[PDB]
Write a protein that binds this DNA or RNA. Structure first.
Ligand code: MG
Ligand code: MG
Ligand code: MG
Ligand code: MG
Ligand code: MG
Ligand code: MG
Ligand code: MG
Ligand code: MG
Lengths: 60, 203, 126, 35, 127, 278, 81
RNA sequence: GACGGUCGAACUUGACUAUCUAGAGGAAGUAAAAGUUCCGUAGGUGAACCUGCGGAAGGAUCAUUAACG
RNA sequence: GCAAGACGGACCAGAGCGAAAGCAUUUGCCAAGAAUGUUUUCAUUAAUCAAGAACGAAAGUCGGAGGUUCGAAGACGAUCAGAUACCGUCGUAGUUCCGACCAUAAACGAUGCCGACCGGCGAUGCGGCGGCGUUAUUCCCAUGACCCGCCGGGCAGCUUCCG
């Protein structure tokens, strides 16, 4: 069975290759990143949504 | 140590300048008619002093309404009409003081409570609450005076039918005259002697 | 003018269960106060656990009650689940802290060490 | 120097780590002595 | 005769409220809190702070013709403690010293029949 | 404060570290210096760090009168506050109060270090080395194993410390991965937090949370506005997430049994339909 | 609450919530003088075109006009010596 | 869109010309001031342990109390 | 003044009920039950039990419905005394209901069941019997409250001989 685990190992290595590749193109823009709310503020309740606009600063 | 917000503090003028004093009157049900004074702002325009003055509820001890009556019973009076510096009130409710209720509750006895919803002849719908306590005998050696559950239900059944009958047959004027000396509660105490002796029976 | 108010407090202390000589301080001094609370206020406790809480406050022969009794310069009456405290404002706070620690389960010996430190450190103790 | 702010939470850690990846990707005088 | 008013005393955990209204309780005459007198958070609930608040309230009613007061003592109620604190007692003492006439004393602490869970958990609070 | 008193344990920990002669050793909490003096024999330089000042003076008198005294260098203060000096290996009996922030401080330190030998509480250490499927697999494990290689070396008993604490101890070796994986770390943090609120729940039930659905719907509406995508009136955020979970085949999986590769698959499936956690 | 540059941008005038006005020298980071004439939050602070005079205003209902007396102070100390 | 005329700020490059400030030094003169024990279960990233819910004592009880001129 | 979700203080007792886990607002309905009373009936139909089956606090899992309060987790604000040691604000899952699972607790008298035998003394809850006297009274509803003696089965005590 130890031989089978070695063969199955290459499959995991191979599948990680394109899976990170496919994730790259689907990413969002930088302006879109700043607008999103973060999950770490879920415990605060509805108070995370009182902010109306926050990403108002940018440097060219 | 903290600056606080800019401004955020206004000059305050005296509000008593624009307000007027009114006299509140109790109905003819009680001996004493003048029960105090109240304050209201004048008619500025599109805001009526009479409108804000109506609907106010006053907590008056019955000792302030009768000459020699007990002081642990309170009456609720609500203003209904204004007649030129004379607030005119009507019966709105009745209640007992907190300390009187606290003192009645001992540890080695049974407490029976009942409530009804009965409409008077003149259309007033009322909710009445009654309370009673089991009484120890004069020659009793036993520590506790507990009533069995069927005895409690029989007493509660007699409470409701006495309260119901004494309200729907009379009108609001006659009911209040019964409430002042608590004749309803004393009638209930006599009727329940055959089931289990009781004391401190009150509405 | 304050005569009638002082007398009403005095009889109230006796009704609560305090000694007559003990309550007499309400007349002679002008800054004594009464505080009350329930044992269930500090911790929700039932049955035999509640009984052990009462015993921890009193101690054997009431010595635990007397230990805190003198050091805080206060009179305390334990009426079933109700605790009544007579003393000045600063001294009530010291006694209330010590009694609360006993209910929450601290051993009396640990409580004794703390109250000694608090009393000694306070330079002005009226 | 007050840079323990990144150690407060994991999201603060990843925000600092994300920017530190960016920097790696993007990336006395003789007069005083002789004269 | 004496003009009557109603005075509400709220002895909270960390503050004391002295509030005077009419007999109906709808019109506010004057309110002073313990924090308005003392410049510290230790002593907002001290009996001395309540005494100063009572004197300012008591003198104010004198110009307005109010001479007699009914008193409604109140604690926090609810799940929390049910009895008025020492600050409420000091305020009543100070009010009588000013010469204000005293009516009837009533405790108006909200007493739940049966209430929700109190904060603190199983272990307890106030250590 | 606790002092390790067993010389054999001190020797064994040093043996596990490579400790090349030219290496610079960073040491946190030398204490009396039993572990410190042996490192000075083999290491080019030892940068000790002690918060308590009186121990620093005690450390100096012990090394004084010895040839290795010149190599020792001492910093006084909190290491978490300040930048770490350049070092090759780290061997330290850490104060357990700062066990968590120090590990992430090491992972954030560039230039890279070869390895770090650290002492932790038994419960803390097992969670660090936990693999998927273990009861102790947690959010700390997946984040630490993402950026480093973590191994368990030995267990340390209570008797070895004076005074004896009531918890057990063990030794853990940490080696960072150079370079870190090329993923968006803000997106990675958001996904892991949602799944690990109840790590033994199914993913389908985890995403049915009312708090989670409200957060995901607002982020989706922001994303649609930026790209001018029209949202239908009858759109439900709950149906969209269920379709994504079915497509990835992760609806009945549990976060306790998910490794790093499964989360990457979940991240791409969610990002494909426009759901970005950030 | 307020900071103003004085003496050709070489000294600083500052007001605080306490009611004290502090004069600073930028080179040495040292408070030359502290002025106690207000008991509340000093919201307003202005200086003239010439550095002779300055104005202050606080939450207390008082407005105070200040004038630089450094030149008069140095005259009095020298005459004694 | 095109031309003239008029008043023209603001720019670009050479050449003169006024002040203010930067650090590191060198050679002097004054002065003697100053600084509780556990059970079951569910979690944890300032874990020498903590927390949520429900249990146990295998944990130190003082005082008043029928009615009532 | 209006709405929503939970909760059933004081009376509440070492009292009562249930196989155990457990069980507290009024009124109505449905089925069940202990003890007592019996000059009713059957006539041994019984005891203990591997296998097998029903139930089983709290927490927890799956699918729905809701969400006041409290609240693991998480984010913020602080972090004095000190062997003196875990706060504050917001508050995720949960805590509530309807269905399926899960089958564990210091789930204690740290103590198998059935039967027989083996000391006194009073109280207490229910049922029955007898009674000098007090106290209410019965259209319906109801025939009770206290005091004394006795008999059963319970919940608990104070004292003890032999063993
Ligand atoms: Mg009730
Ligand atoms: Mg359950
Ligand atoms: Mg549940
Ligand atoms: Mg659910
Ligand atoms: Mg149990
Ligand atoms: Mg057993
Ligand atoms: Mg019974
Ligand atoms: Mg009987």
């Amino acid at each position: 069975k130890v031989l089978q685990k070695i063969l199955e190992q290459k499959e995991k290595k191979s599948q990680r290759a394109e899976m990170l590749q496919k994730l790259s193109e689907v990413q969002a823009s930088e302006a879109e990143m700043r607008l999103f709310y973060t999950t770490s503020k879920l415990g605060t309740g509805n108070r995370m949504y009182h902010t109306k606009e926050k990403a108002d600063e940018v440097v060219a | 140590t903290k600056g606080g917000k800019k401004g955020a503090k206004k000059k305050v003028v005296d509000p008593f300048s624009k307000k007027d004093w009114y006299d509140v009157k109790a109905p003819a049900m009680f001996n004493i008619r003048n029960i105090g004074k109240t304050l209201v702002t004048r008619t500025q325009g599109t805001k009526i002093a009479s409108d804000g003055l109506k609907g106010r509820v006053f907590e008056v001890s019955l000792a302030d309404l009768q000459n020699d009556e007990v002081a642990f019973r309170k009456f609720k009076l609500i203003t209904e009409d204004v007649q030129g510096k004379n607030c005119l009130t009507n019966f709105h409710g009745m209640d007992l003081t907190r300390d009187k209720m606290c003192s009645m509750v001992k540890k080695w006895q049974t407490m029976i409570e009942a409530h009804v919803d009965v409409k008077t002849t003149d259309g007033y719908l009322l909710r009445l609450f009654c309370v009673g306590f089991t009484k120890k005998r004069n020659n009793q050696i036993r520590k506790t005076s507990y009533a069995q559950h069927q005895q409690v239900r029989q007493i509660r059944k007699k409470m409701m039918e006495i309260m119901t009958r004494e309200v729907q047959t009379n009108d609001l004027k006659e009911v209040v005259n019964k409430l002042i000396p608590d004749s309803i509660g004393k009638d209930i105490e006599k009727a329940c002697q055959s089931i289990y002796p009781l004391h401190d029976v009150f509405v | 003018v304050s005569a009638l108010t002082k007398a009403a407090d005095f009889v109230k202390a006796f009704i609560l269960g305090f000694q007559v000589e003990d309550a007499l301080a309400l007349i002679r001094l002008d800054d004594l106060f009464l505080e009350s609370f329930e044992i269930t206020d500090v911790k929700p406790l039932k049955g035999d656990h509640l009984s052990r809480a009462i015993g921890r406050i009193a101690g054997k022969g009431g010595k635990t009650k007397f230990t805190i009794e003198n050091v805080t310069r206060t009179r305390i009456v334990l009426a079933d689940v109700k605790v009544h405290i007579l003393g000045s404002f600063q001294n009530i706070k010291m006694a209330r802290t010590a009694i609360c620690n006993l209910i929450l389960g601290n051993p009396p010996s640990k409580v004794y060490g703390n109250i000694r430190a608090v009393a000694s450190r306070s330079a002005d103790r009226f | 120097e007050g840079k323990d702010k990144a150690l407060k939470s994991s999201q603060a850690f990843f925000s600092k780590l994300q920017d530190q990846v960016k920097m790696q990707i993007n990336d006395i005088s003789v007069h005083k002595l002789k004269l | 005769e004496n003009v009557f008013g109603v005075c509400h005393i709220f002895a909270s955990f960390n503050d004391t409220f002295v509030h005077v209204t009419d007999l109906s309780g709808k019109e506010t005459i004057c309110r002073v809190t313990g924090g308005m007198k003392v410049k510290a958070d230790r002593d907002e609930s001290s009996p001395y702070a309540a005494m100063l608040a009572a004197q300012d309230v008591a003198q104010r009613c004198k110009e307005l013709g109010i001479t007699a007061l009914h008193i409604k003592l109140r604690a926090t109620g609810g799940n929390r403690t049910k009895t008025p604190g020492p600050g409420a007692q000091s305020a009543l003492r100070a009010l009588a010293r000013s010469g204000m006439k005293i009516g009837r004393i009533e405790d108006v602490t909200p007493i739940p029949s049966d209430s929700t869970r109190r904060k603190g958990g199983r272990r307890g609070r106030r250590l | 404060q606790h002092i390790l008193k067993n010389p054999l344990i001190i020797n064994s920990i040093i043996d596990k570290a490579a400790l090349r002669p030219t290496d610079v050793v960073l040491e946190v909490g030398p204490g009396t210096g039993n572990m410190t003096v042996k490192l000075l024999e083999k290491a080019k330089k030892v940068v000790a760090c002690e918060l308590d000042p009186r121990l620093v003076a005690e450390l100096h008198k012990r090394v004084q009168g010895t040839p290795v005294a010149s190599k020792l260098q001492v910093l006084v203060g909190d290491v978490l506050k300040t930048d770490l000096p350049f070092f090759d290996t780290c061997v330290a009996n850490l104060p357990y109060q700062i066990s968590s922030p120090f590990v992430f401080k090491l992972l954030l330190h560039r230039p890279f270090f070869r390895c770090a030998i650290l002492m932790f509480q038994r419960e803390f250490a097992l969670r660090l080395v936990a693999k998927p499927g273990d009861k102790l697999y947690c959010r700390l494990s997946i984040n630490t194993q993402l950026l480093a290689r973590v191994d368990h070396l030995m267990k340390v008993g209570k008797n070895n410390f004076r005074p004896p604490p009531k918890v057990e101890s063990s030794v853990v070796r940490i080696e960072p991965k150079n370079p870190p994986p090329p993923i968006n770390f803000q997106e990675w943090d958001g996904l892991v937090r949602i799944t690990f609120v109840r790590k033994n729940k199914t993913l389908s039930a985890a995403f049915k949370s009312s708090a989670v659905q409200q957060l995901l719907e607002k982020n989706y509406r922001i994303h649609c506005s930026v790209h001018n995508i029209i949202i239908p009136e009858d759109f439900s955020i709950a149906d969209k997430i269920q379709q994504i979970l079915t497509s990835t085949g992760f609806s009945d999986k549990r976060a306790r049994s998910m490794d790093i590769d499964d989360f990457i698959r979940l991240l791409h499936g969610f990002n494909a339909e426009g759901i970005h956690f950030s | 609450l307020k900071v103003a540059f004085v003496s050709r941008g070489t000294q600083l005038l500052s007001s605080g919530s306490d009611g004290l006005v502090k004069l600073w020298t930028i080179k040495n980071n040292e408070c030359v003088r502290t002025l106690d004439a207000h008991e509340d939050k000093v919201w307003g602070l202005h200086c003239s075109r010439l550095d002779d005079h300055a104005l202050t205003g606080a939450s207390d209902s008082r407005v105070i006009l200040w004038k630089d007396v450094t030149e008069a102070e140095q005259a009095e100390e020298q005459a004694r010596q």
